[PDB]
Amino acid sequence: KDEQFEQCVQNFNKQLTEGTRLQKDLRTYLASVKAMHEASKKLNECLQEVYEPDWPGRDEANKIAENNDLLWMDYHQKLVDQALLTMDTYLGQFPDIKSRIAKRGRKLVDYDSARHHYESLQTAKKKDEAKIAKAEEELIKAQKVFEEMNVDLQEELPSLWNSRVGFYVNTFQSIAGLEENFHKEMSKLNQNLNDVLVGLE
Amino acid sequence: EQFEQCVQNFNKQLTEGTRLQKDLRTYLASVKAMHEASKKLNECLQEVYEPDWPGRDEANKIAENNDLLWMDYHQKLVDQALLTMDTYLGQFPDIKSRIAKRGRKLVDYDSARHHYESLQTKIAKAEEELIKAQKVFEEMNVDLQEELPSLWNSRVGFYVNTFQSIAGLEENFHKEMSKLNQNLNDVLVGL
Ligand SMILES: [Xe]
Numbered sequence: 001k002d003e004q005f006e007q008c009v010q011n012f013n014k015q016l017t018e019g020t021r022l023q024k025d026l027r028t029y030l031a032s033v034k035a036m037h038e039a040s041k042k043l044n045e046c047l048q049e050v051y052e053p054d055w056p057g058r059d060e061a062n063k064i065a066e067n068n069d070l071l072w073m074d075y076h077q078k079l080v081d082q083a084l085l086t087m088d089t090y091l092g093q094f095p096d097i098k099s100r101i102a103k104r105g106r107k108l109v110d111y112d113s114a115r116h117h118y119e120s121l122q123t124a125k126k127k128d129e130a131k132i133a134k135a136e137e138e139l140i141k142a143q144k145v146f147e148e149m150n151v152d153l154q155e156e157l158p159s160l161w162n163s164r165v166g167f168y169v170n171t172f173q174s175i176a177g178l179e180e181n182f183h184k185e186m187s188k189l190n191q192n193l194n195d196v197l198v199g200l201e
Numbered sequence: 202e203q204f205e206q207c208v209q210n211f212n213k214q215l216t217e218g219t220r221l222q223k224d225l226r227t228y229l230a231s232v233k234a235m236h237e238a239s240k241k242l243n244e245c246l247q248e249v250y251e252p253d254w255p256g257r258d259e260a261n262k263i264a265e266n267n268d269l270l271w272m273d274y275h276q277k278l279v280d281q282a283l284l285t286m287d288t289y290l291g292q293f294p295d296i297k298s299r300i301a302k303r304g305r306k307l308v309d310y311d312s313a314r315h316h317y318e319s320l321q322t323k324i325a326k327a328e329e330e331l332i333k334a335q336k337v338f339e340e341m342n343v344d345l346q347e348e349l350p351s352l353w354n355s356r357v358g359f360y361v362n363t364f365q366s367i368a369g370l371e372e373n374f375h376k377e378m379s380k381l382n383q384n385l386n387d388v389l390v391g392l
């Protein structure tokens with residue numbers, strides 16, 4: 001039951017470790033998207049550079065390069081708003097639970113100390129009733145302090161653990177939903193450029 | 202003159218072409234980086250997917266297909282866009298050398314004429330030199346006068362074909378990826 005609680009603690013550290021990695025990979029994916037965007041803009045700038053203003057389709061190829069720019073921007077901004085910054089509430093939960101767990105640990109040590117002291121007094125050599133009285137009071141106090149920390153963690157850790165499912169499912173549904181749409185809209189731009197370039201064949 | 206405007210066009214064609222090669226190479230590197238980051242994200246889903254959630258196997262097949270798609274996309278860009286960019290650019294160095302060399306063979310001939318002119322005011326020999334210098338210059342001149350316009354013309358076809366090839370292979374990549382993301386959204390909706 002130390003054991004029951006230590007399992008919650010081990011689940012909590014795993015949940016914390018996995019949720020940290022998922023964001024970092026999200027962050028890295030985000031930075032990829034931005035660099036793919038910048039590279040695509042330079043590549044389109046090469047086409048614009050050679051495409052003369054009077055050649056048929058020039059203005060339209062331009063329109064398409066600007067739509068491409070906008071599409072990458074919107075994908076990246078939506079990923080940020082809908083998948084990355086939507087994690088805030090959930091991860092925000094962790095720091096203070098971690099802290100409360102280490103504090104529960106110290107209050108348990110304090111409680112164990114006060115038990116040990118109370119115990120040393122019960123095996124005199126005539127009992128010193130007054131010292132017993134104070135040690136008993138310190139024991140009961142340190143037990144209450146420990147037991148409050150303990151009771152709130154015991155309901156809170158299973159609740160958090162269970163919510164990890166929702167978090168993962170929702171984050172990946174937002175990313176996959178956004179991604180389906182981006183790639184759909186993309187392909188249309190590729191098609192539009194292709195039809196313009198058919199004119200110069 | 203005419204030949205100097207041809208040389209100018211050529212310098213420009215080489216500059217644009219080199220910039221396109223540099224930018225394509227970057228684009229291919231970015232496509233690889235976006236593949237790898239996407240793959241890692243997928244791996245985070247795979248590592249958290251519980252055995253008692255339905256669709257675990259289907260999610261692994263989707264991720265495997267996703268990896269293969271990205272790999273196919275990058276490889277078609279190499280084959281259809283980049284290695285063709287390289288062949289077109291491979292003709293430029295020798296022509297560039299031949300422009301510089303023609304320039305020198307022109308001064309060579311001018312100074313052989315300015316010398317047959319100078320003596321005539323030993324002459325048996327200078328006229329020999331002038332004929333050799335004329336035959337060597339004019340042989341470079343004619344070859345470049347054909348070749349520079351014909352290279353210049355081919356620029357449009359090379360750009361059109363490069364950018365059409367990209368837009369076709371990208372259309373297919375994006376259409377196919379869109380379907381794979383839809384397949385993953387359907388699995389996830391069922392949790
Ligand atoms: Xe073009």
Ligand SMILES: [Xe]
Nearest residue numbers: 168169172246
């Ligand atoms: Xe998930």
